[PDB]
């Protein structure tokens, strides 16, 4: 993995970057984004910088200096592209800094795309529904839970995936306590339904806004597909024509098995993968 | 700012960075930690805190902590701290999953000064507000994937909750479940004094809450003095009818709640004797 700080330093081999009292490690107190490097450029940089800006505000962090973030992104991207034509996993790390420090910690990291990602794009995954512990109205009633902020505090997110993995499941769909579909621990849920229309849970739910899904909605609408934000329940996933877990690095992963029920493949599954591909280069 | 002791026993250079940029503690908050108070030459309740760190590591699928190495690093950090100053010390154990693709967890001990907020909370108490947590009282048993009983490094929401309360002029928060049962604090355990006579009470521990090392030790000392102690389902009404409410944690030992949701709460003689009960609890193992 390559590291470029916002200062402009490109980090030494094997050398540590963060002090032992950084709020990122001691408290997970920060925000982050993940981007896909494909064909010489990071995808949807501006839209991801906006969501990083939104997460930092919800976290009472200083407003991100976008020219400096763009330079670290550029430098890190080109260092990756120079070494390989392979795709790149680009992440932005933005923590509150050190305990008592006066400056946030900020750097850019590019790493290889995991082998799990290629299988998820090609074969899809099997998923189970798990209770989130939050009601669907929780986002409105409890803004202090900052459920819309993409923070560095992902311990539960990985714990949920480890739980599902032990049961033979490759991913998870979170369901609210009152039975509404929310999101995945690392993805946005999108559904295909017949009048073919695309549907995703509303963003006032205690969920993260999906940058890649939003771009998919614009490209799909332009190609004639209706797209909307709707309250979905577990029955809507089972009666759907397709379920995808949409994210920035893992672009689209169709759910071929949900709670043990094998799901049929449908013609839209072929065109769905081409819509996301056109969406993540829609800014070029 | 702070002394760092690795589990080998090596004491870090003062200004040198420790963690790689791809450590799962920073990239994912993926680890567990504990907090101990260094007081009068020794860290308080070391074994009981190592026991809970072992339990948090189990729930987080982390390798079982090597307790002999942890015990030695604690001492080394303790001895260097007491040698440098007679002040109290805030000692933390950090146990992360390691680096991305790494094969060994990252583990170190950190001792830092005690924040100025602690002395005011011990002496003057705090004002707190009740906030809905969004979890039902049955959440701990039914939903283990939420790992609510693990004390993890993913504290972003906890700090955001206090920032919200701070903007409301409140110094701390008491979480309430969706069905109206008192749960816990973002950084503390809730204990109340009530008559059956004077009895100390804490929310039921099968709840989706963190079990308190300091609260459990308080129960042992309080039971010895003849006080009744039990785990009971409490509601917001029980806090207002109580003779005292304290936020109990390992570094800030006891912070009485003198104001809850704007309503000033009466002070009762047990608040003074409570402050010496916790004091006796954190040295009850010596």
UniProtKB/Swiss-Prot annotation, chain B:
Its EC number is 2.6.1.21, 4.1.3.38. The keyword Transferase applies. Belongs to the class-IV pyridoxal-phosphate-dependent aminotransferase family. Its cofactor is pyridoxal 5'-phosphate. Homodimer. Pathway: Cofactor biosynthesis; tetrahydrofolate biosynthesis; 4-aminobenzoate from chorismate: step 2/2; Cell wall biogenesis; peptidoglycan biosynthesis. GO terms for biological process: carboxylic acid metabolic process; folic acid biosynthetic process; peptidoglycan biosynthetic process; regulation of cell shape; tetrahydrofolate biosynthetic process. Keywords: Aminotransferase, Cell shape, Folate biosynthesis, Lyase, Peptidoglycan synthesis, Pyridoxal phosphate, Transferase. 2-oxoglutarate binds at residues 249, 251-252. CDD domains: ADCL_like. This is Bifunctional aminodeoxychorismate lyase / D-amino acid transaminase. SUPFAM superfamilies: D-aminoacid aminotransferase-like PLP-dependent enzymes. It comes from the Bacteria. Pfam families: Aminotran_4 (PF01063). GO terms for molecular function: 4-amino-4-deoxychorismate lyase activity; pyridoxal phosphate binding; transaminase activity. Pyridoxal 5'-phosphate binds at residues 52, 155, 213-214, 250.
């Amino acid at each position: 993995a390559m590291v470029v700080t916002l200062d402009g330093e490109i980090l030494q081999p094997g050398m540590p970057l963060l002090h032992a009292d950084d709020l990122a490690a001691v408290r997970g107190d920060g925000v982050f984004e993940t981007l896909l490097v494909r064909d010489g450029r990071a995808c949807l940089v501006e839209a991801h910088l906006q969501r990083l800006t939104q997460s930092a505000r919800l976290m009472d962090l200083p407003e991100p200096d976008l020219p400096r973030w763009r330079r670290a992104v550029e430098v890190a991207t080109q260092r990756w592209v120079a070494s390989t034509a392979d795709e790149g996993a680009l992440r932005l790390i933005y923590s509150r800094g050190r305990e008592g420090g006066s400056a946030p910690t900020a750097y850019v990291m590019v790493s290889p795309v995991p082998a799990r990602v290629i299988g998820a794009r090609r074969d899809g995954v099997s998923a189970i529904t798990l209770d989130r512990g939050l009601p669907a109205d929780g986002g409105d009633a409890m803004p202090w839970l900052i459920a819309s902020a993409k923070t560095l505090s992902y311990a539960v997110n990985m714990a949920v995936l480890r739980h599902a993995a032990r049961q033979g499941a490759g991913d998870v769909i979170f369901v609210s306590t009152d039975g509404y579909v929310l999101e995945g621990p690392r993805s946005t849920v999108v559904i295909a339904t017949d009048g073919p229309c695309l549907l995703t849970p509303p963003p006032w739910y205690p969920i993260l806004r999906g940058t890649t899904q939003q771009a998919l909605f614009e490209v799909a609408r332009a190609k004639g597909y209706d797209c909307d934000y709707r309250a979905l329940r577990v029955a809507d996933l089972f009666d759907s024509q397709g379920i995808w877990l949409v994210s920035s690095m893992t672009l689209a992963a169709r759910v071929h098995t949900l709670d043990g029920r094998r799901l049929p493949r449908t013609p839209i599954a072929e065109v769905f993968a081409e819509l996301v591909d056109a969406a993540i280069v829609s800014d070029r």
